[PDB]
């Protein structure tokens, strides 16, 4: 006569027999942040180190501040043997990527790049790469995710986002396909990317209404239909009703 | 003269410092030395000491609030490593100077007990090893000839009347003739039979003539 | 760099060892006399000229500052003598007599065990003249200790009471290491035998913490062992030919850290081994 | 923790509550034939968005679906059928196929994890446990059964594994609530085997014999090993190790909690698969956490 289950953000439903529905909230805000504000690339690896270990000390995590200054210090230096620190970098990995920091396993992992990619297994390094986006897909952090499927160091994560993201448009007046790196009509020699709102070509983002076929330059839709409700090339259509 | 042969360095000798109450500092002072002399590897792993012995790494006494330092790969597995290393490579400065480097930062009943052993980044079923490193370096400290750095390094092992010049209780250094018996405060006498010669309570003895022997 | 020093002895030198500090350097020959420099700065002071044997004087071994400016002495007259410095002068502080054949050498024990000296005589016995304060000496002798003769003896290092072990070399072709039991008798506990001739110099290895027991011994063949116990309970030791001399091989002398090993024979030629990664030893010379 | 109530306004008791993919939504099914959807706003209050009728009998599971396969819901019932409800922009939430082949009650269904696609799993009361799939992710009223695994034991809970990795083969735990006066083993783990395209059974926990109410695979998330959380008279958490034909594993207990002093009805891991929650019949929920000396310790009670 009972149900119970966590959300992803602590929070816990419990309802038992009397039903009374109870959510018994907090606990993951520490992921958030360290996901937003690290840097993964870039930077030459000292600096990366450096800032995510100010980024760990400011969040309360001591210990994975001095882990990357340690490896800040042991990558980017009658010496030590080239590949000593190798076996203690792969063991950090796996101790972060057993106890569910994969987080900081996976940063671990871009940041060094080659360093350490050798040395760990393509499936195990695989499975903490989606660990980490599935995670991050969770909070809803896009932008992070997508950072780190461009910056993993595993070609099937990296495949992940190439995965039917091409569109394909047609010149309405023509009703034929365009070519794949143009802004002007093969057929029609037309400029059919022109912006509904300032009539200049749109050559980068674009922004199409599924309703009407009209759309423009990304800022400027957002700022008329921030401004109104119709469509701004004006073909009575309430694109965004409301 | 066969000290490039030897694994361990006179000048470094001269140039570590071991103060219990600041590790980072004397980390630092010691990564500057080892560069001094030349030493890359001593410069990075007294770097990788000075990161790694944070007094903010200090272990809980609940084992449940945190996986203590030691646990982490770049705690103990790190300094095991570290000492292996210079154990093929006989370093026994260097072994000395990290084991006593991190026992300094080291100053229900059964899981606590265990998790006291498991939160040191200085296994505790190994002590002997660290003290002997800890003695042998000590030996070569003192057979160079410097007896406060084998002292200063021999701290870190585990196992081990009125004056008669100011007339004030002694209770600290005090200097007493054996000839006659009047003494007090160290410095006090430092002092006074730096230019007199006898006794100071008047006596007549020749106290630096029959004491120091 | 080089402090060459000219002995002035009138015979060929046997032995040369400097102190505990590096300072002082005492050398004998078969002129019957000890000659103790100073060799500070690169200097020489002939501080002492020691004339008390009646035969040449094969070994000579500095104690540990710990106990004072000692000095010991073993001479083919079958004869101990230690020489202790007092007031800036060298003179003869203790006799011993105990041996019917010549004294080959002597090695005092580490200062934690105390102030032990052991000789190795040829007619095969070891004495240990243990010191107990008030200037008297206590002869503990190991009578028999090899068939033939022992020829030189060496101390284990103080490693945890404190259990007493030396390393003789003797005639017999063979080495014997001893222990002393709880009582103070001394026994015999693993006999060493893997050299071909007369075992000319056995040498402990220094402990710097290691949980490992070497001892280099050399022969009168020209074999070089490396004896290695690598667990302590065990107490197997497993030679390991250093190197084959085409001579015969006289001293062995560790480092510090014993990781070199100076290498000495009768081709009047010194060698400098170090240890590879690989477990062969390397000559550096 | 910080308890707050909410008004159900079911008419009978709740026996399923279950978090969507990204924890802002809610859907709870009680024994009146009602599913109702929760979405809550910035405000922080939860707002029943949809609440509809869908079965004859009572209703003992919902379960949510990846969010890339759309808003899929599925419900299973006392009337021996796995409905799967889809969300159509107001919000309007339609049945796209009714799951008939169990001949008997279906007391749990659970969606497979992204990775396999957008599978089903039921278990029904007579030991028979079917897998579902649906081929065109776009299509949700054609599904097809791949396979149905005899667990000749009245299952009663399921639980996938929730691992990502490739080296990991698909697995599924079959947990059962009969109470026969035999002792033998509640909970059967099959192991999906690619060079025989089917499901065989892997691992058998001997050692679980009480009836168990509930099964929750841990959320692996970087881990090289499962761990499996079962609910029965105590709270019991093994762990299986994969060794280097179904895979072996060396199960050991790590986890044996008796501070119910009743019967454990529910067991949920929490999103990093750390800390476990156990309710009860004493009605309170017990938060089980390890520390680094894997010594499984109760962080907290909470209760209604
Ligand atoms: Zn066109
Ligand atoms: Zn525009
Ligand atoms: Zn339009
Ligand atoms: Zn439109
Ligand atoms: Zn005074
Ligand atoms: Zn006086
Ligand atoms: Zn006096």
Same mark, same amino acid.
């Given at each position: 006569?009972?149900?119970?289950?966590?959300?992803?953000?602590?929070?816990?439903?419990?309802?038992?027999?009397?039903?009374?529905?109870?959510?018994?909230?907090?606990?993951?805000?520490?992921?958030?942040?360290?996901?937003?504000?690290?840097?993964?690339?870039?930077?030459?690896?000292?600096?990366?180190?450096?800032?995510?270990?100010?980024?760990?000390?400011?969040?309360?995590?001591?210990?994975?501040?001095?882990?990357?200054?340690?490896?800040?210090?042991?990558?980017?230096?009658?010496?030590?043997?080239?590949?000593?620190?190798?076996?203690?970098?792969?063991?950090?990995?796996?101790?972060?990527?057993?106890?569910?920091?994969?987080?900081?396993?996976?940063?671990?992992?871009?940041?060094?790049?080659?360093?350490?990619?050798?040395?760990?297994?393509?499936?195990?390094?695989?499975?903490?790469?989606?660990?980490?986006?599935?995670?991050?897909?969770?909070?809803?952090?896009?932008?992070?995710?997508?950072?780190?499927?461009?910056?993993?160091?595993?070609?099937?994560?990296?495949?992940?986002?190439?995965?039917?993201?091409?569109?394909?448009?047609?010149?309405?007046?023509?009703?034929?396909?365009?070519?794949?790196?143009?802004?002007?009509?093969?057929?029609?020699?037309?400029?059919?990317?022109?912006?509904?709102?300032?009539?200049?070509?749109?050559?980068?983002?674009?922004?199409?209404?599924?309703?009407?076929?009209?759309?423009?330059?990304?800022?400027?839709?957002?700022?008329?239909?921030?401004?109104?409700?119709?469509?701004?090339?004006?073909?009575?259509?309430?694109?965004?009703?409301? | 003269?066969?000290?490039?042969?030897?694994?361990?360095?006179?000048?470094?000798?001269?140039?570590?410092?071991?103060?219990?109450?600041?590790?980072?500092?004397?980390?630092?002072?010691?990564?500057?030395?080892?560069?001094?002399?030349?030493?890359?590897?001593?410069?990075?792993?007294?770097?990788?000491?000075?990161?790694?012995?944070?007094?903010?790494?200090?272990?809980?006494?609940?084992?449940?609030?945190?996986?203590?330092?030691?646990?982490?790969?770049?705690?103990?597995?790190?300094?095991?490593?570290?000492?292996?290393?210079?154990?093929?490579?006989?370093?026994?400065?260097?072994?000395?100077?990290?084991?006593?480097?991190?026992?300094?930062?080291?100053?229900?009943?059964?899981?606590?007990?265990?998790?006291?052993?498991?939160?040191?980044?200085?296994?505790?079923?190994?002590?002997?090893?660290?003290?002997?490193?800890?003695?042998?370096?000590?030996?070569?400290?003192?057979?160079?000839?410097?007896?406060?750095?084998?002292?200063?390094?021999?701290?870190?092992?585990?196992?081990?009347?009125?004056?008669?010049?100011?007339?004030?209780?002694?209770?600290?250094?005090?200097?007493?003739?054996?000839?006659?018996?009047?003494?007090?405060?160290?410095?006090?006498?430092?002092?006074?039979?730096?230019?007199?010669?006898?006794?100071?309570?008047?006596?007549?003895?020749?106290?630096?003539?029959?004491?120091?022997? | 760099?080089?402090?060459?020093?000219?002995?002035?002895?009138? *015979?060929?030198?046997?032995?040369?060892?400097?102190?505990?500090?590096?300072?002082?350097?005492?050398?004998?020959?078969?002129?019957?006399?000890?000659?103790?420099?100073?060799?500070?700065?690169?200097?020489?002071?002939?501080?002492?000229?020691?004339?008390?044997?009646?035969?040449?004087?094969?070994?000579?071994?500095?104690?540990?500052?710990?106990?004072?400016?000692?000095?010991?002495?073993?001479?083919?007259?079958?004869?101990?003598?230690?020489?202790?410095?007092?007031?800036?002068?060298?003179?003869?502080?203790?006799?011993?007599?105990?041996?019917?054949?010549?004294?080959?050498?002597?090695?005092?024990?580490?200062?934690?065990?105390?102030?032990?000296?052991?000789?190795?005589?040829?007619?095969?016995?070891?004495?240990?003249?243990?010191?107990?304060?008030?200037?008297?000496?206590?002869?503990?002798?190991?009578?028999?200790?090899?068939?033939?003769?022992?020829?030189?003896?060496?101390?284990?290092?103080?490693?945890?009471?404190?259990?007493?072990?030396?390393?003789?070399?003797?005639?017999?072709?063979?080495?014997?290491?001893?222990?002393?039991?709880?009582?103070?008798?001394?026994?015999?506990?693993?006999?060493?035998?893997?050299?071909?001739?007369?075992?000319?110099?056995?040498?402990?290895?220094?402990?710097?913490?290691?949980?490992?027991?070497?001892?280099?011994?050399?022969?009168?063949?020209?074999?070089?062992?490396?004896?290695?116990?690598?667990?302590?309970?065990?107490?197997?030791?497993?030679?390991?030919?250093?190197?084959?001399?085409?001579?015969?091989?006289?001293?062995?002398?560790?480092?510090?850290?014993?990781?070199?090993?100076?290498?000495?024979?009768? *081709?009047?030629?010194?060698?400098?081994?170090?240890?590879?990664? *690989?477990?062969?030893?390397?000559?550096?010379? | 923790?910080?308890?707050?109530?909410?008004?159900?306004?079911?008419?009978?008791?709740?026996?399923?509550?279950?978090?969507?993919?990204?924890?802002?939504?809610?859907?709870?099914?009680?024994?009146?034939?009602?599913?109702?959807?929760?979405?809550?706003?910035?405000?922080?209050?939860?707002?029943?968005?949809?609440?509809?009728?869908?079965?004859?009998?009572?209703?003992?599971?919902?379960?949510?679906?990846?969010?890339?396969?759309?808003?899929?819901?599925?419900?299973?019932?006392?009337?021996?059928?796995?409905?799967?409800?889809?969300?159509?922009?107001?919000?309007?939430?339609?049945?796209?196929?009714?799951?008939?082949?169990?001949?008997?009650?279906?007391?749990?269904?659970?969606?497979?994890?992204?990775?396999?696609?957008?599978?089903?799993?039921?278990?029904?009361?007579?030991?028979?446990?079917?897998?579902?799939?649906?081929?065109?992710?776009?299509?949700?009223?054609?599904?097809?059964?791949?396979?149905?695994?005899?667990?000749?034991?009245?299952?009663?809970?399921?639980?996938?594994?929730?691992?990502?990795?490739?080296?990991?083969?698909?697995?599924?735990?079959?947990?059962?609530?009969?109470?026969?006066?035999?002792?033998?083993?509640?909970?059967?783990?099959?192991?999906?085997?690619?060079?025989?395209?089917?499901?065989?059974?892997?691992?058998?926990?001997?050692?679980?014999?009480?009836?168990?109410?509930?099964?929750?695979?841990?959320?692996?998330?970087?881990?090289?090993?499962?761990?499996?959380?079962?609910?029965?008279?105590?709270?019991?958490?093994?762990?299986?190790?994969?060794?280097?034909?179904?895979?072996?594993?060396?199960?050991?207990?790590?986890?044996?909690?008796?501070?119910?002093?009743?019967?454990?009805?529910?067991?949920?891991?929490?999103?990093?698969?750390?800390?476990?929650?156990?309710?009860?019949?004493?009605?309170?929920?017990?938060?089980?956490?390890?520390?680094?000396?894997?010594?499984?310790?109760?962080?907290?009670?909470?209760?209604?």
């Amino acid at each position: 006569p009972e149900g119970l289950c966590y959300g992803l953000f602590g929070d816990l439903a419990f309802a038992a027999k009397e039903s009374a529905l109870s959510v018994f909230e907090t606990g993951m805000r520490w992921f958030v942040d360290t996901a937003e504000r690290y840097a993964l690339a870039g930077r030459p690896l000292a600096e990366l180190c450096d800032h995510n270990a100010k980024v760990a000390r400011e969040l309360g995590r001591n210990q994975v501040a001095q882990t990357w200054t340690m490896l800040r210090i042991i990558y980017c230096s009658s010496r030590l043997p080239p590949d000593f620190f190798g076996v203690l970098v792969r063991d950090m990995l796996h101790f972060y990527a057993e106890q569910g920091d994969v987080q900081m396993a996976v940063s671990v992992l871009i940041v060094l790049g080659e360093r350490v990619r050798k040395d760990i297994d393509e499936q195990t390094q695989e499975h903490w790469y989606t660990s980490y986006i599935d995670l991050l897909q969770r909070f809803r952090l896009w932008n992070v995710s997508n950072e780190v499927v461009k910056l993993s160091t595993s070609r099937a994560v990296s495949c992940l986002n190439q995965a039917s993201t091409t569109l394909h448009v047609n010149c309405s007046h023509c009703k034929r396909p365009m070519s794949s790196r143009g802004w002007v009509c093969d057929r029609c020699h037309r400029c059919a990317s022109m912006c509904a709102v300032c009539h200049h070509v749109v050559k980068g983002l674009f922004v199409w209404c599924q309703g009407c076929s009209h759309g423009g330059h990304l800022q400027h839709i957002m700022k008329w239909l921030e401004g109104s409700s119709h469509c701004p090339a004006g073909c009575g259509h309430l694109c965004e009703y409301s | 003269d066969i000290a490039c042969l030897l694994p361990v360095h006179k000048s470094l000798g001269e140039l570590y410092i071991l103060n219990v109450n600041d590790i980072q500092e004397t980390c630092q002072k010691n990564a500057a030395s080892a560069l001094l002399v030349g030493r890359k590897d001593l410069v990075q792993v007294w770097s990788l000491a000075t990161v790694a012995t944070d007094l903010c790494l200090g272990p809980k006494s609940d084992p449940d609030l945190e996986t203590p330092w030691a646990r982490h790969p770049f705690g103990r597995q790190l300094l095991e490593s570290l000492l292996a290393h210079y154990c093929r490579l006989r370093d026994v400065q260097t072994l000395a100077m990290l084991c006593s480097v991190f026992e300094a930062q080291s100053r229900r009943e059964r899981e606590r007990d265990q998790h006291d052993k498991n939160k040191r980044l200085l296994d505790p079923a190994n002590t002997q090893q660290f003290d002997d490193f800890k003695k042998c370096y000590g030996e070569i400290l003192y057979r160079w000839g410097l007896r406060e750095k084998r002292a200063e390094v021999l701290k870190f092992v585990s196992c081990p009347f009125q004056c008669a010049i100011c007339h004030v209780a002694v209770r600290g250094s005090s200097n007493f003739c054996l000839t006659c018996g009047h003494g007090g405060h160290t410095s006090h006498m430092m002092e006074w039979f730096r230019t007199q010669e006898v006794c100071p309570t008047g006596c007549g003895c020749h106290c630096l003539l029959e004491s120091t022997f | 760099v080089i402090n060459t020093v000219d002995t002035s002895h009138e *015979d060929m030198i046997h032995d040369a060892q400097m102190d505990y500090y590096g300072t002082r350097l005492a050398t004998c020959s078969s002129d019957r006399s000890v000659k103790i420099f100073d060799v500070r700065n690169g200097g020489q002071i002939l501080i002492a000229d020691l004339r008390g044997h009646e035969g040449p004087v094969w070994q000579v071994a500095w104690a540990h500052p710990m106990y004072g400016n000692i000095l010991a002495s073993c001479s083919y007259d079958r004869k101990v003598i230690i020489w202790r410095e007092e007031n800036g002068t060298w003179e003869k502080s203790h006799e011993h007599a105990g041996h019917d054949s010549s004294v080959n050498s002597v090695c005092w024990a580490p200062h934690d065990y105390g102030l032990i000296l052991a000789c190795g005589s040829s007619d095969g016995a070891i004495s240990l003249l243990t010191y107990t304060g008030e200037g008297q000496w206590e002869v503990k002798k190991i009578n028999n200790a090899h068939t033939i003769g022992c020829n030189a003896v060496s101390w284990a290092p103080a490693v945890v009471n404190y259990i007493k072990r030396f390393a003789s070399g003797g005639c017999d072709n063979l080495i014997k290491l001893w222990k002393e039991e709880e009582d103070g008798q001394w026994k015999e506990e693993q006999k060493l035998e893997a050299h071909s001739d007369w075992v000319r110099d056995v040498a402990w290895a220094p402990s710097i913490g290691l949980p490992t027991s070497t001892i280099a011994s050399c022969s009168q063949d020209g074999r070089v062992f490396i004896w290695t116990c690598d667990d302590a309970s065990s107490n197997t030791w497993s030679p390991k030919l250093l190197h084959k001399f085409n001579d015969v091989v006289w001293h062995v002398s560790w480092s510090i850290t014993a990781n070199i090993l100076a290498v000495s024979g009768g *081709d009047n030629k010194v060698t400098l081994w170090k240890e590879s990664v *690989d477990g062969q030893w390397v000559c550096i010379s | 923790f910080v308890a707050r109530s909410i008004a159900a306004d079911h008419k009978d008791l709740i026996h399923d509550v279950s978090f969507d993919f990204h924890g802002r939504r809610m859907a709870t099914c009680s024994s009146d034939q009602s599913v109702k959807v929760w979405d809550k706003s910035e405000s922080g209050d939860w707002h029943c968005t949809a609440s509809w009728k869908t079965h004859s009998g009572s209703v003992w599971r919902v379960t949510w679906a990846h969010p890339e396969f759309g808003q899929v819901l599925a419900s299973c019932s006392f009337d021996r059928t796995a409905a799967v409800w889809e969300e159509i922009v107001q919000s309007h939430w339609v049945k796209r196929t009714t799951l008939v082949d169990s001949r008997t009650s279906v007391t749990d269904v659970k969606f497979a994890p992204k990775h396999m696609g957008l599978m089903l799993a039921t278990c029904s009361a007579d030991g028979i446990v079917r897998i579902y799939e649906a081929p065109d992710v776009m299509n949700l009223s054609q599904w097809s059964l791949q396979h149905e695994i005899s667990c000749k034991l009245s299952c009663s809970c399921i639980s996938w594994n929730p691992s990502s990795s490739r080296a990991h083969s698909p697995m599924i735990a079959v947990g059962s609530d009969d109470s026969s006066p035999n002792a033998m083993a509640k909970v059967q783990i099959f192991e999906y085997n690619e060079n025989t395209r089917k499901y065989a059974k892997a691992e058998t926990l001997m050692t679980v014999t009480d009836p168990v109410h509930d099964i929750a695979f841990a959320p692996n998330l970087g881990r090289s090993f499962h761990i499996l959380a079962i609910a029965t008279k105590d709270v019991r958490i093994f762990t299986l190790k994969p060794v280097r034909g179904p895979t072996k594993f060396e199960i050991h207990i790590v986890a044996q909690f008796d501070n119910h002093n009743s019967q454990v009805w529910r067991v949920s891991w929490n999103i990093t698969g750390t800390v476990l929650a156990s309710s009860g019949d004493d009605g309170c929920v017990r938060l089980w956490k390890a520390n680094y000396m894997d010594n499984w310790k109760c962080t907290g009670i909470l209760k209604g």
